[PDB]
Design a protein around this motif. Structure first.
Motif, PDB file in Angstrom:
ATOM      1  N   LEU A 137       0.847  -1.197   0.000  1.00 42.72           N
ATOM      2  CA  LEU A 137       0.000   0.000   0.000  1.00 42.72           C
ATOM      3  C   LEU A 137       0.881   1.246   0.000  1.00 42.72           C
ATOM      4  N   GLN A 138       1.954   1.236   0.818  1.00 41.96           N
ATOM      5  CA  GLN A 138       2.926   2.311   0.916  1.00 41.96           C
ATOM      6  C   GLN A 138       3.700   2.469  -0.391  1.00 41.96           C
ATOM      7  N   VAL A 139       4.160   1.350  -1.028  1.00 41.57           N
ATOM      8  CA  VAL A 139       4.863   1.463  -2.321  1.00 41.57           C
ATOM      9  C   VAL A 139       3.921   2.051  -3.383  1.00 41.57           C
ATOM     10  N   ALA A 140       2.615   1.666  -3.344  1.00 38.46           N
ATOM     11  CA  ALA A 140       1.618   2.193  -4.272  1.00 38.46           C
ATOM     12  C   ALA A 140       1.463   3.698  -4.132  1.00 38.46           C
ATOM     13  N   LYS A 141       1.349   4.218  -2.874  1.00 34.58           N
ATOM     14  CA  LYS A 141       1.267   5.654  -2.577  1.00 34.58           C
ATOM     15  C   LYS A 141       2.497   6.435  -3.045  1.00 34.58           C
ATOM     16  N   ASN A 197      14.673  -2.075  -4.283  1.00 33.74           N
ATOM     17  CA  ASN A 197      14.796  -0.631  -4.404  1.00 33.74           C
ATOM     18  C   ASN A 197      13.875   0.166  -3.475  1.00 33.74           C
ATOM     19  N   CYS A 198      13.277  -0.473  -2.487  1.00 30.14           N
ATOM     20  CA  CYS A 198      12.389   0.181  -1.532  1.00 30.14           C
ATOM     21  C   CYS A 198      13.047   0.105  -0.203  1.00 30.14           C
ATOM     22  N   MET A 199      13.070   1.209   0.537  1.00 23.35           N
ATOM     23  CA  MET A 199      13.782   1.245   1.801  1.00 23.35           C
ATOM     24  C   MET A 199      12.870   1.322   3.012  1.00 23.35           C
ATOM     25  N   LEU A 200      13.336   0.821   4.150  1.00 24.90           N
ATOM     26  CA  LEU A 200      12.547   0.843   5.378  1.00 24.90           C
ATOM     27  C   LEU A 200      13.236   1.706   6.412  1.00 24.90           C
ATOM     28  N   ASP A 201      12.523   2.699   6.958  1.00 23.18           N
ATOM     29  CA  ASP A 201      13.117   3.561   7.973  1.00 23.18           C
ATOM     30  C   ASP A 201      12.864   2.965   9.387  1.00 23.18           C
ATOM     31  N   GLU A 202      13.283   3.680  10.451  1.00 25.98           N
ATOM     32  CA  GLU A 202      13.169   3.306  11.867  1.00 25.98           C
ATOM     33  C   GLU A 202      11.740   3.028  12.320  1.00 25.98           C
ATOM     34  N   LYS A 203      10.749   3.642  11.669  1.00 21.16           N
ATOM     35  CA  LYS A 203       9.335   3.391  11.980  1.00 21.16           C
ATOM     36  C   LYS A 203       8.672   2.430  10.968  1.00 21.16           C
ATOM     37  N   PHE A 204       9.475   1.715  10.165  1.00 23.23           N
ATOM     38  CA  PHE A 204       9.029   0.767   9.137  1.00 23.23           C
ATOM     39  C   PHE A 204       8.188   1.431   8.051  1.00 23.23           C
ATOM     40  N   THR A 205       8.555   2.661   7.679  1.00 21.92           N
ATOM     41  CA  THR A 205       7.875   3.366   6.614  1.00 21.92           C
ATOM     42  C   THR A 205       8.632   3.056   5.328  1.00 21.92           C
ATOM     43  N   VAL A 206       7.929   2.497   4.323  1.00 21.64           N
ATOM     44  CA  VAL A 206       8.534   2.145   3.043  1.00 21.64           C
ATOM     45  C   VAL A 206       8.742   3.407   2.201  1.00 21.64           C
ATOM     46  N   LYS A 207       9.927   3.544   1.603  1.00 20.53           N
ATOM     47  CA  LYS A 207      10.272   4.689   0.775  1.00 20.53           C
ATOM     48  C   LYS A 207      10.843   4.205  -0.573  1.00 20.53           C
ATOM     49  N   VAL A 208      10.169   4.507  -1.680  1.00 19.45           N
ATOM     50  CA  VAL A 208      10.626   4.124  -3.021  1.00 19.45           C
ATOM     51  C   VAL A 208      11.954   4.835  -3.298  1.00 19.45           C
ATOM     52  N   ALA A 209      12.948   4.084  -3.752  1.00 19.55           N
ATOM     53  CA  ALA A 209      14.286   4.625  -3.976  1.00 19.55           C
ATOM     54  C   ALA A 209      14.930   3.925  -5.235  1.00 19.55           C
ATOM     55  N   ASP A 210      16.214   4.154  -5.556  1.00 21.50           N
ATOM     56  CA  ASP A 210      16.885   3.484  -6.659  1.00 21.50           C
ATOM     57  C   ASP A 210      18.347   3.326  -6.289  1.00 21.50           C
ATOM     58  N   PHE A 211      18.803   2.089  -6.160  1.00 20.40           N
ATOM     59  CA  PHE A 211      20.203   1.828  -5.839  1.00 20.40           C
ATOM     60  C   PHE A 211      20.874   0.910  -6.882  1.00 20.40           C
TER      61      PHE A 211
END
Ligand SMILES: C[C@@H](c1ccccc1)n1cc(-c2cc(F)cc(F)c2)c(=O)[nH]c1=O
Length: 258
Positions: A119-123, A142-156
């Motif tokens: 749902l988070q990757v979709a947003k 390519n999706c990252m997880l922060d300290e609060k488990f919030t998914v963030k679309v990225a590119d590595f």
């Protein structure tokens, strides 16, 4: 270099007056490659990725500097140093990439948590599409997880097992071929990091998809969610759901899931 591009990129440029790069401190034991711990000074923990083409790099820096959304990894800034390689400065992601997190035998997110990540990757993808930003490499890695488990679309980072049929054939990419890759990402989430098409080699993926064959429904994946993946792999690009529809549909499944 075009002098206007140089003027326009200055707001993205960061230097040693605020950024301390710890080059002897690699992130995640080498998982992301040349990515080092960094500090932005009022201390901020960051990730410093080390890298004609300069023109396109400055242009991308400007575009990515504008990204502001909880499910898109931010571009804190870039470094264009007289001596050395260009650097990309991103926020430090406590729990690394999504593929690794869910593959790890020491982590057990519930079925609902995995749907929540999707749902988070979709947003994040709904936001990127609204800016006409075509990813070209959307995957769990390519999706990252922060300290609060919030998914963030990225590119590595060819990821042929995530590409849409038209991208494999014509080499062109759109928000509709990103929707296809999103479907494979949802599959990765529901399989907990399993590799897609384990019995189909790279060179025969096109023929397998042309035969109308798709990734099988993972066990414990809800039937409505599997339907969504099938819509993402529609052979006609124009018939795939938008990221706005994927947000609506996945929120509905998520909030009703028992
Ligand atoms: C902001 C973030 C991102 C990328 C895509 C989608 C969402 C988020 N990002 C950007 C770059 C990047 C930044 C540049 F300034 C120039 C460039 F060539 C790459 C990168 O290497 N990694 C990464 O995660």
């Amino acid at each position: 270099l075009n002098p206007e591009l140089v003027q326009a990129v200055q707001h993205v440029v960061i230097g040693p007056s605020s950024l301390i790069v710890h080059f002897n401190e690699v992130i995640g034991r080498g998982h992301f490659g040349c990515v080092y711990h960094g500090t932005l000074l009022k201390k901020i923990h960051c990730a410093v990725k080390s890298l004609g083409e300069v023109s396109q790099f400055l242009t991308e820096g400007i575009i990515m500097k504008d990204f502001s959304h909880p499910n898109v990894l931010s571009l804190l800034g870039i470094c264009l140093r007289s001596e050395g390689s260009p650097l990309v400065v991103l926020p430090y992601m406590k729990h690394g990439d999504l593929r690794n997190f869910i593959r790890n035998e020491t982590h057990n997110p519930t079925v609902k948590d995995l749907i929540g990540f999707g749902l988070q990757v979709a947003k994040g993808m709904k936001y990127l599409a609204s800016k006409k930003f075509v990813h070209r490499d959307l995957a769990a890695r390519n999706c990252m997880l922060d300290e609060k488990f919030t998914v963030k679309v990225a590119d590595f980072g060819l990821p042929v097992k995530w590409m849409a049929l038209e991208s494999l054939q014509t080499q062109k990419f759109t928000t509709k071929s990103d929707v296809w890759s999103f479907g494979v990402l949802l599959w990765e989430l529901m399989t907990r990091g399993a590799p897609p098409y384990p019995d189909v080699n790279t060179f025969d993926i096109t023929v397998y998809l042309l035969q109308g064959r798709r990734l099988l429904q993972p066990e414990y994946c809800p039937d409505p969610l599997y339907e969504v993946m099938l819509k993402c792999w529609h052979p006609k690009a124009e018939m795939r759901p938008s990221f706005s529809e994927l947000v609506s549909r996945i929120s509905a499944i998520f909030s009703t899931f028992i």
